[PDB]
Amino acid sequence: LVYDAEFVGSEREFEEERETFLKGVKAYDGVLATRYLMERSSSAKNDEELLELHQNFILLTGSYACSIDPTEDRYQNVIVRGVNFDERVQRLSTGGSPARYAIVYRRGWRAIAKALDIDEEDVPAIEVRAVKRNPLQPALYRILVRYGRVDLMPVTVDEVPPEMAGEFERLIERYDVPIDEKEERILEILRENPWTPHDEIARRLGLSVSEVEGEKDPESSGIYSLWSRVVVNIEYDERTAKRHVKRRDRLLEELYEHLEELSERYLRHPLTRRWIVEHKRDIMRRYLEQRIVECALKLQDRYGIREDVALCLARAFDGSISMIATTPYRTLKDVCPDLTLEEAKSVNRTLATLIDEHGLSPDAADELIEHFESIAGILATDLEEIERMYEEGRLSEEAYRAAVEIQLAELTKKEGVGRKTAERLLRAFGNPERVKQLAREFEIEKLASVEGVGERVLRSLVPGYASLISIRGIDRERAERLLKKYGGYSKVREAGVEELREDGLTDAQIRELKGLKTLESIVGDLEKADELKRKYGSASAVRRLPVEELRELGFSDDEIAEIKGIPKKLREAFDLETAAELYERYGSLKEIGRRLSYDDLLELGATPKA
Numbered sequence: 001l002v003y004d005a006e007f008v009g010s011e012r013e014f015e016e017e018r019e020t021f022l023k024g025v026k027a028y029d030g031v032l033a034t035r036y037l038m039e040r041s042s043s044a045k046n047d048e049e050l051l052e053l054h055q056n057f058i059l060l061t062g063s064y065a066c067s068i069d070p071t072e073d074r075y076q077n078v079i080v081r082g083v084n085f086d087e088r089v090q091r092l093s094t095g096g097s098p099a100r101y102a103i104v105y106r107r108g109w110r111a112i113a114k115a116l117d118i119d120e121e122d123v124p125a126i127e128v129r130a131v132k133r134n135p136l137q138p139a140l141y142r143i144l145v146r147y148g149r150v151d152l153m154p155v156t157v158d159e160v161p162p163e164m165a166g167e168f169e170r171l172i173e174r175y176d177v178p179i180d181e182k183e184e185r186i187l188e189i190l191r192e193n194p195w196t197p198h199d200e201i202a203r204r205l206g207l208s209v210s211e212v213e214g215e216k217d218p219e220s221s222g223i224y225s226l227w228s229r230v231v232v233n234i235e236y237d238e239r240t241a242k243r244h245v246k247r248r249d250r251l252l253e254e255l256y257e258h259l260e261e262l263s264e265r266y267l268r269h270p271l272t273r274r275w276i277v278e279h280k281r282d283i284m285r286r287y288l289e290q291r292i293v294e295c296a297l298k299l300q301d302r303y304g305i306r307e308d309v310a311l312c313l314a315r316a317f318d319g320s321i322s323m324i325a326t327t328p329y330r331t332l333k334d335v336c337p338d339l340t341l342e343e344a345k346s347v348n349r350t351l352a353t354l355i356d357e358h359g360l361s362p363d364a365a366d367e368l369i370e371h372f373e374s375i376a377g378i379l380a381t382d383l384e385e386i387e388r389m390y391e392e393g394r395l396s397e398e399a400y401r402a403a404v405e406i407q408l409a410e411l412t413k414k415e416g417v418g419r420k421t422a423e424r425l426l427r428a429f430g431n432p433e434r435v436k437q438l439a440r441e442f443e444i445e446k447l448a449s450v451e452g453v454g455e456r457v458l459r460s461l462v463p464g465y466a467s468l469i470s471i472r473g474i475d476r477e478r479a480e481r482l483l484k485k486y487g488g489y490s491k492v493r494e495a496g497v498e499e500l501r502e503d504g505l506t507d508a509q510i511r512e513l514k515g516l517k518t519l520e521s522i523v524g525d526l527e528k529a530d531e532l533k534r535k536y537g538s539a540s541a542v543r544r545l546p547v548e549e550l551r552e553l554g555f556s557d558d559e560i561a562e563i564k565g566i567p568k569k570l571r572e573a574f575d576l577e578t579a580a581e582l583y584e585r586y587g588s589l590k591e592i593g594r595r596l597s598y599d600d601l602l603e604l605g606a607t608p609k610a
């Protein structure tokens, strides 16, 4: 399997990167060492002070990783397992560093270490994919690294705010990012537990990990895309980036100092920088080993690969189904030539879809995997770039054509949208994911200004346009203004009546929207109808309310008589309290003559009742 990368910065930059990387390695050495201590005993497993130190190393590795390729120009032709990230990162809407994009992949450091000449024999590992023990929401951690966010990466487990961890969703709400339906589904699990592993998120949603994750860019769909959407909209805090670079090297010393102290809880001899420098390779070789077991065991239980092949893959791909699952068939067979295609299609869902649901050849599917990794990766790419690749001879016809048909199918599925209107939209706005996002942001004029995009298109594309526009008198401009101001139909429906008037809605329009025509019979004006619609569900409910309650913060006793349909004869004798109660209980009045003659002891000798 091929890893490689070439440096293109100046000689100063070369040394800057070497020092950062080597400090990342030193930081990651602490992560390995602390993981080692944690499984010396179940007592060590549950040492929270040890866990806090483990986490501190994770943080510092992140910070150092964020600093790789600060100017986003120092590396080129970054190959990880044969796939060239230079070209892919360039096609993303937010571009960025091929180096850091590489580092977010397991064993991506391999590629970067070659460009910085750090000899692979010393295993200069930097990994930034911790899940269960990560002090930040794991996907966030990874996206911060890809976007080089030295500033946002905390350098201390104390410094980690809830909004980047246990209450991560707060951070999402602060930046008014559009969330699609896949993502809202993913959040529902992350809300239960932000440290749910991705293959679990995928298994419950009935998706591949690639689908759960998406591309690491705003214009995709998935937890990575979501976090990118948020993170890019956070101002770079150049100040705090300075604090973090200034402080972290000595914090690392201090972490290593704390590692000695703690290690004496579980070991005869301290765990020192020299010790980890010596055992690093051995520690890593052993973890790889029990991950080959666990993983090769899963390749049989879940996917059903013949035992001897399942171990081959397990070894070849560092014990990672994520890794295996995103590897092309040609590369998979290169290292395990015993493997069969139905077996490859079992673990690599992208390969499976491309073959079985788009009739692609394995070579052609490999081509698309290599360039884009997943379907999400195809949909993150501008249509016209895919055309360019086809024309420039860097993409075969069958791959190219499948790519087009995937992009078009995301829009033609939406009733009203034909192929040339879909095709046009992709030209106007780049890719299908970016088209959808404009619809969720309610950019109705922007979309409409494309040929073939009519009311029927707008209906099926823009959430809540269907609802507002089907009310007479509400024009397109208004529908956009309303949707944008309040955040979608449901939120517009929830708006106050006073402020909807200010927005220029006729009272008829407001009445239909909240569907309180029946309540406005019962009560004079719109506003009180709405007040009554909030607390109580319907008119139906308001009538049933106790006589005291209606009377209280309400209006007349005659009005309460009319509201509950209390007959003249029953109203003329008893007081309301007991009249509306007898009616509630028996319904007719003929029936009211079920209870005995002068059990009707209340008021006059009203004989017409018996």
Ligand SMILES: [Zn+2]
Residues within 6 Å of the ligand: 154, 155, 159, 240, 243, 244
């Ligand atoms: Zn800080």
